[PDB]
């Protein structure tokens, strides 16, 4: 059994797999897509065995029948003799910023203002964030919430995708994975560093990683936590150091999905792949670090310390948790059981 597959997003991820592949003696091999949804397909289609995945698409994955083999576990210091491969998930703070500087700008007062998103059906980025506000607001017209937006994987021509700039060139506006600029957690967050949002839904580490000094890159060179405010559920507003206190949510950490008969095989291939080159890895500083792309989070989040074993062998919905499945569902009315695909 012993080749993995492992599926790429976008052109980047694709470069930095490639290095993961040769560094592994070709143990880990390569496919690319333009977008995880289409990542999900090649391996249904068995022409990929797996990827890394945000909580969202773990949603849209189980609908068809793949299967959570590894969950991303963060620096966490709370349950620290065991392993962190065998360390409980904690789940991550889903939390929406802003400009200090923006005074005046609460929760209530989010319609048409500029939203930044991580990409449209990721947990932090949209799941969370929109269906409290169609909670909120009694409508699935959530399209015409904020007067502008970048939501990668919307319509480029939408309003939705307005804020988005594409890539180097301009070109591939929008589309969900990394050659948009504003895409994912890094992207959306320097969507409202740079002002071109008036608020950017990410998780609470998002905004630790990229502001006083953690980051180096151009954009966030200069950035101060104290220049962003958490926007709490209840009208308030607190630093970015009251997370604990003032989140959206907590989300079910990234997790690593393949086919139900693949699953045994990704995940023994995995864990020695991680123990060369994750946190402690063999050869990780020197030769190749599975968990590191510059702060881009390429195939991994890079605040990821290892992948870890789930525990209950669980099915898709319990690793997701019932409220989070929930959320979901009812999101998703907006747009009642099967495989997208
Ligand atoms: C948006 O608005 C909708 C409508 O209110 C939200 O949907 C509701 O979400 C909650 C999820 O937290 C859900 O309540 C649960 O109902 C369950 C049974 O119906 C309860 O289960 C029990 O929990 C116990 C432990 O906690 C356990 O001992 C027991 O065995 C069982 O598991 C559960 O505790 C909650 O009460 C509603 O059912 C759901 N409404 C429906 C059916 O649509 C949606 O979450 C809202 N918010 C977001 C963020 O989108
Ligand atoms: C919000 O996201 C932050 C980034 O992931 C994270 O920040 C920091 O907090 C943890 C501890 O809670 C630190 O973790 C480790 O803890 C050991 C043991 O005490 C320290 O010696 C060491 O510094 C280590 O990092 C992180 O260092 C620290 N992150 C950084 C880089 O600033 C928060 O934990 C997180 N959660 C919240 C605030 O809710
Ligand atoms: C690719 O996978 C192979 C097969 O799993 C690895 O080779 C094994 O390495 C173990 C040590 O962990 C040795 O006992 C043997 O040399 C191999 N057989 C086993 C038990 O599988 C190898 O580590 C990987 N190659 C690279 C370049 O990473
Ligand atoms: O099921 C769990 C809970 O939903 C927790 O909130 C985060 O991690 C998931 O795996
Ligand atoms: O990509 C699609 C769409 O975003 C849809 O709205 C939900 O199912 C996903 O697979
Ligand atoms: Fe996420
Ligand atoms: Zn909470
Ligand atoms: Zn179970």
New binding site residues.
């Given amino acids: 059994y012993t080749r993995v597959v492992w599926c790429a997003v976008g052109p980047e991820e694709q470069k930095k797999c490639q290095q993961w592949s040769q560094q592994s003696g070709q143990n880990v091999t390569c496919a690319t897509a333009s977008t995880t949804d289409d990542c999900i397909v090649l391996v249904l289609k068995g022409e990929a065995d797996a990827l890394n995945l945000d909580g969202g698409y773990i949603y849209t994955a189980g609908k068809c029948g793949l299967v959570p083999v590894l ?1 991303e576990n963060r620096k966490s210091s709370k349950h620290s003799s065991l392993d962190c491969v065998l360390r409980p ?3 991550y703070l889903a939390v929406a910023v802003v400009k200090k500087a923006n005074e005046g700008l609460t929760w209530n007062s989010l319609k048409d203002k500029k939203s930044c998103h991580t990409a449209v059906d990721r947990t932090a980025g949209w799941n969370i964030p929109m269906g409290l506000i169609v909670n909120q607001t009694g409508s699935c017209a959530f399209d015409e919430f904020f007067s502008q937006s970048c939501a990668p994987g919307a319509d480029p021509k939408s309003r939705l995708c307005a804020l988005c700039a594409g890539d180097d060139q301009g070109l591939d506006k929008c589309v969900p994975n990394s050659k948009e600029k504003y895409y994912g957690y890094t992207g959306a967050f320097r969507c409202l560093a740079e002002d071109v949002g008036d608020v950017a839904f990410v998780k609470n580490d998002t905004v630790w990683e990229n502001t006083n000094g953690e980051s180096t890159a151009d954009w966030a060179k200069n950035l101060k936590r104290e220049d962003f405010r958490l926007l709490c559920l209840d009208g308030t507003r607190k630093p970015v150091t009251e997370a604990q206190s003032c989140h959206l949510a ?4 990234h997790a690593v999905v393949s086919r139900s008969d693949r699953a045994a095989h990704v995940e023994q291939v995995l864990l020695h792949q991680q123990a060369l080159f994750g946190k402690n890895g063999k050869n990780c500083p020197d030769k190749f670090c599975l968990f590191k792309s510059e702060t881009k989070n390429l195939l991994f989040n890079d605040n990821t310390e290892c992948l870890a074993k789930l525990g209950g062998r669980p099915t898709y919905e ?4 019932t ?2 499945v929930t959320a979901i569902a009812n999101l998703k009315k907006c747009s009642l059981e099967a495989c997208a695909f």
């Avoid at 907590?250 to 950490?253: G, I, L, Y």
């Avoid at 319990?318 to 948790?321: N, Q, V």
């Fill in positions: 969950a998930t904690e789940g907590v989300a079910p950490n319990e690793y997701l948790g409220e989070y």
